[PDB]
Design a protein around this motif. Structure first.
Motif, PDB file in Angstrom:
ATOM      1  N   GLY A 117       6.339   2.208   9.613  1.00 30.27           N
ATOM      2  CA  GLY A 117       7.598   1.612  10.001  1.00 30.27           C
ATOM      3  C   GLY A 117       8.260   2.347  11.147  1.00 30.27           C
ATOM      4  O   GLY A 117       7.603   2.952  11.999  1.00 30.27           O
ATOM      5  N   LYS A 118       9.592   2.279  11.169  1.00 24.72           N
ATOM      6  CA  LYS A 118      10.355   2.978  12.200  1.00 24.72           C
ATOM      7  C   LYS A 118      10.231   4.489  12.048  1.00 24.72           C
ATOM      8  O   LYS A 118      10.156   5.216  13.045  1.00 24.72           O
ATOM      9  N   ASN A 119      10.216   4.979  10.806  1.00 23.64           N
ATOM     10  CA  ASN A 119      10.075   6.413  10.577  1.00 23.64           C
ATOM     11  C   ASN A 119       8.667   6.894  10.906  1.00 23.64           C
ATOM     12  O   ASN A 119       8.440   8.095  11.088  1.00 23.64           O
ATOM     13  N   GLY A 120       7.708   5.974  10.981  1.00 19.84           N
ATOM     14  CA  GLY A 120       6.337   6.325  11.273  1.00 19.84           C
ATOM     15  C   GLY A 120       5.530   6.803  10.088  1.00 19.84           C
ATOM     16  O   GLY A 120       4.395   7.260  10.277  1.00 19.84           O
ATOM     17  N   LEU A 121       6.075   6.720   8.877  1.00 20.59           N
ATOM     18  CA  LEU A 121       5.340   7.159   7.699  1.00 20.59           C
ATOM     19  C   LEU A 121       4.224   6.177   7.364  1.00 20.59           C
ATOM     20  O   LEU A 121       4.437   4.964   7.291  1.00 20.59           O
ATOM     21  N   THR A 122       3.032   6.715   7.156  1.00 18.82           N
ATOM     22  CA  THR A 122       1.843   5.968   6.774  1.00 18.82           C
ATOM     23  C   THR A 122       1.669   6.082   5.272  1.00 18.82           C
ATOM     24  O   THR A 122       2.327   6.903   4.624  1.00 18.82           O
ATOM     25  N   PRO A 123       0.812   5.246   4.669  1.00 18.07           N
ATOM     26  CA  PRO A 123       0.525   5.431   3.235  1.00 18.07           C
ATOM     27  C   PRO A 123      -0.027   6.806   2.906  1.00 18.07           C
ATOM     28  O   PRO A 123       0.222   7.325   1.811  1.00 18.07           O
ATOM     29  N   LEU A 124      -0.767   7.417   3.835  1.00 15.60           N
ATOM     30  CA  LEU A 124      -1.214   8.792   3.640  1.00 15.60           C
ATOM     31  C   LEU A 124      -0.031   9.750   3.567  1.00 15.60           C
ATOM     32  O   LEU A 124      -0.035  10.689   2.764  1.00 15.60           O
ATOM     33  N   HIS A 125       0.990   9.528   4.403  1.00 18.85           N
ATOM     34  CA  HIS A 125       2.185  10.367   4.365  1.00 18.85           C
ATOM     35  C   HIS A 125       2.846  10.324   2.994  1.00 18.85           C
ATOM     36  O   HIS A 125       3.183  11.369   2.427  1.00 18.85           O
ATOM     37  N   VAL A 126       3.028   9.123   2.441  1.00 21.43           N
ATOM     38  CA  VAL A 126       3.687   8.987   1.146  1.00 21.43           C
ATOM     39  C   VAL A 126       2.809   9.544   0.034  1.00 21.43           C
ATOM     40  O   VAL A 126       3.308  10.153  -0.922  1.00 21.43           O
ATOM     41  N   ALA A 127       1.492   9.343   0.135  1.00 24.46           N
ATOM     42  CA  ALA A 127       0.579   9.869  -0.874  1.00 24.46           C
ATOM     43  C   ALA A 127       0.599  11.393  -0.904  1.00 24.46           C
ATOM     44  O   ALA A 127       0.565  11.999  -1.981  1.00 24.46           O
ATOM     45  N   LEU A 168       0.827  -1.203   0.000  1.00 21.97           N
ATOM     46  CA  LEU A 168       0.000   0.000   0.000  1.00 21.97           C
ATOM     47  C   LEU A 168       0.864   1.256   0.000  1.00 21.97           C
ATOM     48  O   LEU A 168       0.521   2.253  -0.645  1.00 21.97           O
ATOM     49  N   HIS A 169       1.991   1.222   0.716  1.00 24.72           N
ATOM     50  CA  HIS A 169       2.928   2.342   0.689  1.00 24.72           C
ATOM     51  C   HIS A 169       3.469   2.572  -0.715  1.00 24.72           C
ATOM     52  O   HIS A 169       3.586   3.717  -1.164  1.00 24.72           O
ATOM     53  N   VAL A 170       3.815   1.492  -1.419  1.00 27.19           N
ATOM     54  CA  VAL A 170       4.350   1.616  -2.771  1.00 27.19           C
ATOM     55  C   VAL A 170       3.282   2.147  -3.720  1.00 27.19           C
ATOM     56  O   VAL A 170       3.560   2.991  -4.584  1.00 27.19           O
ATOM     57  N   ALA A 171       2.046   1.664  -3.574  1.00 29.38           N
ATOM     58  CA  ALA A 171       0.948   2.173  -4.390  1.00 29.38           C
ATOM     59  C   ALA A 171       0.713   3.658  -4.136  1.00 29.38           C
ATOM     60  O   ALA A 171       0.446   4.421  -5.072  1.00 29.38           O
ATOM     61  N   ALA A 172       0.802   4.084  -2.874  1.00 28.74           N
ATOM     62  CA  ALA A 172       0.669   5.502  -2.556  1.00 28.74           C
ATOM     63  C   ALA A 172       1.815   6.314  -3.145  1.00 28.74           C
ATOM     64  O   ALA A 172       1.611   7.440  -3.613  1.00 28.74           O
ATOM     65  N   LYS A 173       3.030   5.762  -3.116  1.00 24.83           N
ATOM     66  CA  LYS A 173       4.185   6.466  -3.666  1.00 24.83           C
ATOM     67  C   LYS A 173       4.062   6.651  -5.172  1.00 24.83           C
ATOM     68  O   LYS A 173       4.369   7.727  -5.700  1.00 24.83           O
ATOM     69  N   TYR A 174       3.610   5.619  -5.879  1.00 19.90           N
ATOM     70  CA  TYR A 174       3.577   5.642  -7.335  1.00 19.90           C
ATOM     71  C   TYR A 174       2.190   5.897  -7.906  1.00 19.90           C
ATOM     72  O   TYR A 174       1.997   5.745  -9.116  1.00 19.90           O
ATOM     73  N   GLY A 175       1.225   6.282  -7.074  1.00 14.25           N
ATOM     74  CA  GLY A 175      -0.063   6.722  -7.572  1.00 14.25           C
ATOM     75  C   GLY A 175      -0.927   5.650  -8.191  1.00 14.25           C
ATOM     76  O   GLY A 175      -1.801   5.966  -9.002  1.00 14.25           O
ATOM     77  N   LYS A 176      -0.713   4.385  -7.832  1.00 13.41           N
ATOM     78  CA  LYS A 176      -1.495   3.277  -8.379  1.00 13.41           C
ATOM     79  C   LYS A 176      -2.795   3.174  -7.587  1.00 13.41           C
ATOM     80  O   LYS A 176      -2.872   2.555  -6.522  1.00 13.41           O
ATOM     81  N   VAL A 177      -3.844   3.798  -8.127  1.00  9.39           N
ATOM     82  CA  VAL A 177      -5.095   3.909  -7.383  1.00  9.39           C
ATOM     83  C   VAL A 177      -5.886   2.606  -7.450  1.00  9.39           C
ATOM     84  O   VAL A 177      -6.628   2.270  -6.520  1.00  9.39           O
ATOM     85  N   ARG A 178      -5.729   1.840  -8.533  1.00 10.36           N
ATOM     86  CA  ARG A 178      -6.442   0.568  -8.637  1.00 10.36           C
ATOM     87  C   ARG A 178      -5.808  -0.489  -7.743  1.00 10.36           C
ATOM     88  O   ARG A 178      -6.513  -1.265  -7.083  1.00 10.36           O
ATOM     89  N   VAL A 179      -4.475  -0.533  -7.707  1.00  8.05           N
ATOM     90  CA  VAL A 179      -3.777  -1.459  -6.821  1.00  8.05           C
ATOM     91  C   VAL A 179      -4.081  -1.126  -5.366  1.00  8.05           C
ATOM     92  O   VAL A 179      -4.347  -2.019  -4.551  1.00  8.05           O
ATOM     93  N   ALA A 180      -4.056   0.164  -5.020  1.00  2.37           N
ATOM     94  CA  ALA A 180      -4.405   0.581  -3.667  1.00  2.37           C
ATOM     95  C   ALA A 180      -5.853   0.241  -3.341  1.00  2.37           C
ATOM     96  O   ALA A 180      -6.161  -0.178  -2.219  1.00  2.37           O
ATOM     97  N   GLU A 181      -6.755   0.416  -4.312  1.00  5.71           N
ATOM     98  CA  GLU A 181      -8.152   0.037  -4.121  1.00  5.71           C
ATOM     99  C   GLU A 181      -8.283  -1.442  -3.790  1.00  5.71           C
ATOM    100  O   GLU A 181      -8.973  -1.811  -2.834  1.00  5.71           O
ATOM    101  N   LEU A 182      -7.615  -2.303  -4.561  1.00 11.21           N
ATOM    102  CA  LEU A 182      -7.710  -3.740  -4.318  1.00 11.21           C
ATOM    103  C   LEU A 182      -7.098  -4.123  -2.973  1.00 11.21           C
ATOM    104  O   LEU A 182      -7.675  -4.927  -2.223  1.00 11.21           O
TER     105      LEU A 182
END
Length: 375
Positions: A131-141, A105-119
């Motif tokens: 993770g350790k840095n505390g970044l959420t998929p919302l953070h990367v998006a 989900l983090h990778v999908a948020a980083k690369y804008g894959k909305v269908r992959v994130a949807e699934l």
């Protein structure tokens, strides 16, 4: 690259050759250079049927590379929805994380894959995994400016209140990067404009420092406190003075922000603006009743800062607006003495006219906060 024939079939996509190789003699989970399985190579190109064949025979989705990328991570990177569906049907783990701390989900948020994130969010994905840095998929998006990913993550549980290692929220990143629409979505889903970092920095501080007047107005429309200060007492007006954006100072002053707010050591926005050489904001503050003869705890005037930093035009503007020479700081230095001490010839020449006959440097507090979320 320690490439088996099965790996070469996986990269190209001939499912019949790989079928025959797996029938006679081929390790499905064989690893290669960079710790890559044939499942990784098949998921990179997105060949769905070959992925199903490999996964059906013996392939394990949870195997990861030296960078920590499972085939789910690669398929999310390249936006292969059918490959992601097949992998998830064959028990791929979304809880698997890379070395950076990224879920699929983090990778999908980083690369804008909305269908992959949807699934993924459809089938068992935590929107607030970190993770350790505390970044959420919302953070990367928010960091990569994926409006669709943000608008998909927010209804399903993407929390605007999730803090990073430095305490940054997604609204912090949106305010710093002038993503107005992302900020509106985050504020609609409960984002707080007064959320503080580990050093007391709010999204209003970042918006004012980066000179985003529309972002500052948007935050102020959502109960942002313009008089709130960080750990060092710096206000958004202080950061505006540090960088020198007139339109942001206009919005802040129209809101009702105190012009003569002081930090821990007594620095005003006029002090910071005179220190950093922003003559237009000095004029703006002096038009809006800033104390030209304000003194810090050590007795330093804005004229002292102007003479110390060698801004001759700032010195002239301050003297024209009622700055008082011959005033002595607690260190015992007049602005003319400071100008002579660091040898600013122009500032000395200007100050010598208005000064009557008669090793510490004053530095305003600064914000060292920065977020490392790229790459």
């Amino acid at each position: 690259k320690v490439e088996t024939p099965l790996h070469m079939a996986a990269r190209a996509g001939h499912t019949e050759v790989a079928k025959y190789l797996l029938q006679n003699k081929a390790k499905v989970n064989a690893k290669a250079k960079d710790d890559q399985t044939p499942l990784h190579c098949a998921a990179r190109i997105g060949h769905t049927n070959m992925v199903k064949l490999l996964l059906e025979n013996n392939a394990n989705p949870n195997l990861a590379t030296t960078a920590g990328h499972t085939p789910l991570h690669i398929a999310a990177r390249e936006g292969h929805v059918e490959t992601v569906l097949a992998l998830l049907e064959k028990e791929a783990s979304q809880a698997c994380m890379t070395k950076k701390g990224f879920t699929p989900l983090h990778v999908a948020a980083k690369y804008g894959k909305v269908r992959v994130a949807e699934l993924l969010l459809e089938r068992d994905a935590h929107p607030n995994a970190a993770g350790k840095n505390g970044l959420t998929p919302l953070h990367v998006a928010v960091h990569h400016n994926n409006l669709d990913i943000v608008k998909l993550l927010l209804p399903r549980g993407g929390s605007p209140h999730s803090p990073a290692w430095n305490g940054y929220t997604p609204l912090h990143i949106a305010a710093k990067q002038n993503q107005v629409e992302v900020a509106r979505s985050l504020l609609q889903y409960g984002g707080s404009a007064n959320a503080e970092s580990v050093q007391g920095v709010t999204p209003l501080h970042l918006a004012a420092q980066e000179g985003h007047a529309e972002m500052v107005a948007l935050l102020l429309s959502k109960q942002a406190n313009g008089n709130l200060g960080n750990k060092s007492g710096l206000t958004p007006l202080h950061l505006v003075a540090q960088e020198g954006h007139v339109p942001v100072a206009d919005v802040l002053i129209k809101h009702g922000v105190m012009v003569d707010a002081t930090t821990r050591m007594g620095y005003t926005p006029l002090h910071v603006a005179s220190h950093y050489g922003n003559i237009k904001l000095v004029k703006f503050l002096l038009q809006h009743q800033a104390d030209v003869n304000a003194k810090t705890k050590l007795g330093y005037s804005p004229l002292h800062q102007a003479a110390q930093q060698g801004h001759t035009d700032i010195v002239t503007l301050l003297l024209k607006n009622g700055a008082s020479p011959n005033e002595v700081s607690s260190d015992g230095t007049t602005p003319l003495a400071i100008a002579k001490r660091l040898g600013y010839i122009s500032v000395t020449d200007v100050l010598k006219v208005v000064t009557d006959e008669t090793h510490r440097m004053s530095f305003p507090e600064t914000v060292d906060e920065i977020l490392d979320v790229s790459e």
